[PDB]
Ligand binder design. Structure first.
Ligand SMILES: [Cl-]
Lengths: 114, 114, 114
């Protein structure tokens, strides 16, 4: 699993330990071992959501499996919860794109997960 | 709908109001309310297009439906049009990836659009 | 083909000609003319892999065709190799997302590739 968040919230407002918290919570939620969970946070972005420049985030979660209707609802509650608590972003100003990747379409370690 | 533009054009060359213009025009093009539209512009990128570092752009448009052969041609004309006029990027140095998303795979407001 | 690299490796650690080298290698590897190849490198990123902030990379390769099990393995060896040699990133801290797009879902020059 890889989780990326793009946000217009400034760098200074991202708290120490945010990447590790994202890692642990995602390991928990997705089942997958934390050793292979990747996370990318991108602050200070030039964005608008609904035409407004109030705090917002555009995110993506890529996973080999563990993507589905019920699971995705659960991930969003988790991730929106984190973004609201740690970055003060309203959950209704967050979009998260979910990608169910084929193992053959994910490269890692000079090869793929196929 | 969410639209992301990555470009090697400098921040100073992004005109005031560009994010609002993208929002308004995407609302018109997709027929969705501007309130749902998210836009993200990323200037000053380290990019090459065809081995050249003249102005270029790599973009994506994520939508739940409203994606298709004819509609995407219409989006490209519109968005290339804006990138040329506002950022002075030649349309033939623009790639736009279109994603037709399932509602179940778009998180928002602690849930999904399903 | 579009190739994007996101990495926590510093900018100054990205060698001159890395974009050019990416372009030629990708041209050779995909059989596509260098004129069609786009490359995007994003250094200095706030990222973690396996909870660790040691050098790592999150990448994607978008192409119309030329994507599949065997092909993606060869790409992964090629690109991890280039990341290891040029950016000193361990192959086992690299993810590459492969996207096989329909020509109709790639915008370019006021239209699509369809
Ligand atoms: Cl989808």
């Amino acid at each position: 699993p890889m989780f990326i968040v793009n946000t217009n919230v400034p760098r200074a407002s991202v708290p120490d330990g945010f990447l590790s918290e994202l890692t642990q919570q995602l390991a928990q939620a997705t089942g997958k071992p934390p050793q292979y969970i990747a996370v990318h946070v991108v602050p200070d972005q030039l964005m608008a959501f609904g035409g407004s420049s109030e705090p917002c985030a555009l995110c993506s979660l890529h996973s080999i499996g563990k993507i589905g209707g019920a699971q995705n609802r659960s991930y969003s509650k988790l991730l929106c919860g984190l973004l609201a608590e740690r970055l003060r972003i309203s959950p209704d100003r967050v979009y998260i794109n979910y990608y169910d990747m084929n193992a053959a379409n994910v490269g890692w370690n000079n090869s793929t997960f196929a």
